[PDB]
């Protein structure tokens, strides 16, 4: 008969899921950003150009004024179109003369014989082209699209665990177990060899596997604990829906006091842990200790939860069990993100080196 | 005594191996090539060279004829020997005096200004020399030798699981369990505290751990299931070698319905799960619930499989249990395949940007 | 009642730690070589410098001697104090004329006409300027600072397992169990529901969980094994501290005969396996089978170990159980080291191409 500690293995696997919820999942990565460097290189290119070129960006009416594209349109073969928005962004601070003087000495390029400036201007244009050729590689924006945020991943984890965007408090305010569809008795709520459960998320599955009730409190109700039962007082025959005080007495079995560095292989190992413990039967798969008939909490029956999406003839948990599929989505986004962050580090290092050399007057006069 | 659900741990470990078999293991890595981009750069260098240099790769007779090295030997005062094959290969279309002009304009290099051509040629030159340097990296071919195919890996996995190159069908057609060595009774087949099993692959080990028979169907035969026993009807004392019908009744407990991305970490975890469940003794190591004397399937004996290659005094499974060593070989070959990928595509991104710059007419004119 | 094999799950998780100890944990990742490439480009740049420049790094008394800065202070009208230490590292070998002539030959610079030498020198100084700027990326300096060694992590793992820098021999010489604080009986040594154990490391936690004593050898003392009990002969009511012979009879249950590839994900998984197996109560957390009151080894009580640092209301094992926090440091170091190796890949490959380019005479003369 199912007694004390007989569900420690299933509790450990499920708690590996519950501990990821809340704000406890951390991305802990460096968003690669080379836009400031690029915008500065482009400013250096415009700062070092000939005034004739910058005068193409002034307004014919007023000097320190953006060229009104409606007033002075662009030529035909000019190809200046579409590059104007990037150029004007670099030219807008330099339309003022005082700033242009300031940027000249900031970039350490003011006060040189024309030949020296000619030499520096040529390399900077070449350098600026190399920086643009990398920043505009179609691999970028591809990787940038595959970037996620810590908050988007946290919301998905809390949806897979609680079906909410945030982890409920210790009273589970704004939370109702089993979507409010618990009905008759624990076997109807938690499932059987012929029927699925009413638990759609991870937390309610954990309650089906670990909660004690008024009947098993001295035997099967200690399957996830050691010396003292959870003491939920759950009486599903009378009141089916567990109250928040009961849910918290089961969640406290899981580590809700730490943090986890979000890795894709970390999610994979936790989902694999849960999925491999499902025992595949003719009509359902069972997670937890099961002896006979159903998941009623009876010490001769089972302390478990049942799913109809996975059987000994079909089903992959991370694809067909909804809450597991949601967490597998988080793993997939973590993968795309980790590959994107890595791929965007190469142009970031290149553009930093371009900017560093462009501000070395010695390297420019070689 | 051994009862329902007592081998869920071992079933999860062994099914983590089984699900890797068939064609379910995917090598989703991208085999890199940059030969496309490199060859185009080399053509550009020759398309931009002096016609005296293109005339070097022609026969002294017909202009469209290539130079016969036997007819015209190479100048021994020059290094023109080693690089002659790559030069001609790129030049071979350019020997045609019409393809040259087409390519000359196709690379935005046909035009005017013999001075501005020489400018372009000089930059194409440097870009080419840097491109061949970025890809020259000696340690190649041996790195391409440390490359495998998804098919070769899957054949090794199936050899670890089934001793075959392909997974048997749902009738185990063409499959003989235990290498056709089963005899006497279940303990002789599956081992004991003093002797090993006849099972040399993973599937047959899972059968020893999880099969019910004609005696334990109401007790220990339910060790890996929840509701109903597998139902093999195995009777080794009458017929030792089980049928495919019986074998499939156990394999249906594992997930044969999905896929698994092949990573060396994925193989390592699954091998450690099985390896650390081996209970090390003086003469054998036992996988599965063991109580008394042998792995006979009796509820007072054991539902297990025994190995003599690792004990409490010797042996590491990933090197001394043949089927685990074969699966570890997939892990070693995959960590080499991964390591060679990075060291064969690092030029790929650098070569691609060089082509964009070499095809930019402005970049040629600095 | 606690019987044969009831602690296999706990043995496998704790043996996942013990097997990391000794010199079995391996840092198989390639060790970066970034500074060595940079140091080589610096030495090449010095060989190519004018003899007047190299003469600035010798004192006036014996050319073979390095210039003493106190004897010949650097010109306060130069930035030479900013580059002297690196400059001197490159000059010192070349101070000897043979070593200089040999380097000029190795780098294909010896026997060069003045114009060709100056042309090559200028290109080498441009490549050298690019290599230095690349090393100035803060991510490069951070990555080299985040690189670990295998020996450092091996000492840390052994400190988590044995509280020692080296794994004790098969008689545990120099090792005293429970830091010499065992007393009274097994329940005070291994803990209870109200009190923590005297086990500060992982090896003594494995002993509490798996050691038979002179009273449970036929029942609970087989919780970690199959047929034959460990046979320690432990009698904590007479002599509390177990002898090294007893400790080894438990350690022989783990695989100490192989190796483990070190990785942050591999350490995280092994820690999680132990951390979530801890059954969290109001006053202690228990690892192992538990039925009644304490971890006394009695079949009606428990084969377990107790911690007071984690409860159902507080604590994360990897931060609050000291030996687990030690092992978690290894993971964090492996995290930064793995990111550092990845970030140093492209710049080290980029410096390598600079070295081969600076050793191609054709490229230097373009
Ligand atoms: C690869 O190898 C090359 C050599 O092949 C090597 O190049 C060397 O680069 C360094 C700089 O990194 C050069 O150092 C310069 O040296 C000159 C000359 O100093 C001598 O001559 C002066 C008189 O002209 C004497 O007074 C003096 O005693 C020395 O004998 C210095 O003049 C340079 O310093 C000036 O500029 C610095 C900034 O760049 C200032 O910090 C410094 O205060 C000096 O300022 C002077 O000029 C200012 C105007 O700009 C003026 O305002 C000040 O009042 C002041 O007068 C500088 O130290 C060295 O010459 C190069 N070696 C050569 C060409 O042979 C590379 O370093 C090497 N690569 C790497 C990475 O190691
Ligand atoms: C890309 O195209 C451009 C051409 O526009 C080039 O960059 C390159 O083609 C060729 O690259 C090779 C590799 O360096 C160059 O070879 C060198 O040619 C030198 C001159 O050739 C000889 O010409 C006549 C015929 O014999 C002779 O009278 C001359 O005296 C002269 O020797 C040649 O001197 C040199 O040989 C040297 O080889 C080693 C170099 O250190 C030493 O053993 C020794 O110094 C020896 O002298 C070498 O063979 C070639 O010039 C160049 N083509 C042109 C037109 O410049 C293309 N690159 C790629 C890979 O696509
Ligand atoms: C950086 O600044 C320098 C100028 O000092 C240039 O390298 C470049 O400014 C302009 O670059 C564009 C091309 O990107 C040139 O436009 C060309 O105009 C031609 C007609 O006159 C047309 O036929 C071509 O197709 C181009 O569109 C423009 O001349 C040039 N400005 C000059 C030379 O003053 C800047 N580059 C970047 C990356 O911002
Ligand atoms: C679960 O199975 C037990 C034993 O057959 C039964 O008593 C319960 O009623 C059932 O829910
Ligand atoms: C396994 O051990 C049990 C108990 O001793 C015995 O009854 C069986 O015959 C044996 O195979
Ligand atoms: C552990 O619990 C059992 C059963 O109550 C008791 O007999 C032992 O004395 C205790 O250590």
Numbering used by the authors:
A (entry chain C), B (entry chain B), C (entry chain A): 24 to 389
How did the manuscript describe this experimental structure?
Long-term immune evasion by the African trypanosome is achieved through repetitive cycles of surface protein replacement with antigenically distinct versions of the dense Variant Surface Glycoprotein (VSG) coat. The mature VSG proteins are attached to the cell surface by a GPI-anchor, and consist of two main regions: (1) a large, N-terminal domain (NTD) of roughly 300–400 amino acids that is most distal to the membrane and (2) a smaller, membrane-proximal C-terminal domain (CTD) spanning 80–120 amino acids beneath the NTD that harbors the GPI-anchor. These large subdomains are elongated folds centered on a three-helix bundle scaffold.
An additional crystal form of VSG11 shows non-crystallographic trimerization in the asymmetric unit, while another form also raises the possibility of an inherent flexibility that could be present in the VSG proteins. In addition to helping establish that this specific trimeric arrangement is the preferred oligomerization of this class (at least at higher concentrations), the independent monomers in this asymmetric unit display a range of alternative conformations, particularly in the bottom lobe of the protein and even in some limited regions of the three-helix bundle. Examination of the set of alignments from the monomers of the 18mer show that it appears that the divergence primarily occurs in the lower lobe. Finally, when the different monomers of the 18mer are compared with the other crystal forms described, a wide variety of conformational changes is seen, although these changes are limited to the bottom lobe and lower regions of the bundle. Due to the high flexibility of the bottom lobes in the 18mer crystals, not all amino acids in some monomers of the bottom lobe could be modeled.
